[PDB]
Amino acid sequence: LAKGYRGQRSRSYRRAKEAVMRALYYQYRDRKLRKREFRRLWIARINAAVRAYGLNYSTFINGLKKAGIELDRKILADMAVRDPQAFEQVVNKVKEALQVQ
């Protein structure tokens, strides 16, 4: 046991652990960056979808929250292309929650 537990003062240990640390870093980074690329499209797409409805990503979000609708950007973005009419409903239910005087 030298890589699972107990950090030997071994000459070989120091080298193997260094390799383990480099695997961890590179992977962790690809994950985060890959994940950043998506969140990027999710918002680009959602904004673009509510344009024709007189809204922008910012207003659609701060509106969804005051209507009690709990949905993620990956779900939002998906719906807009999978079921366009259902997507329209959420928007209306949000325009209703917003425009109230």
Next chain:
Amino acid sequence: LAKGYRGQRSRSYRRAKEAVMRALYYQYRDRKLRKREFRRLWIARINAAVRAYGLNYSTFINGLKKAGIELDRKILADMAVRDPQAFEQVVNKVKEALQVQ
């Protein structure tokens, strides 16, 4: 709000609710699957790499466990190409451990 919380028996509900579930089933299937192609990739390399040292994926995993070495096949398949030498050192530790008189 036939989406976030409270499942009102309206036309909107069912429609928007089916949409959510479809977005969920799809994104879930892609993860599982993508996570499944890699799992196969890893094992295929680690095997081919432990080849010349006189072992296969099976024996190498049995050894990693008798020597108390907790490393992922994700980490493993990484080291095998990033630091071939350090990899050799884990091999030699498993092989050693393995033979007992």
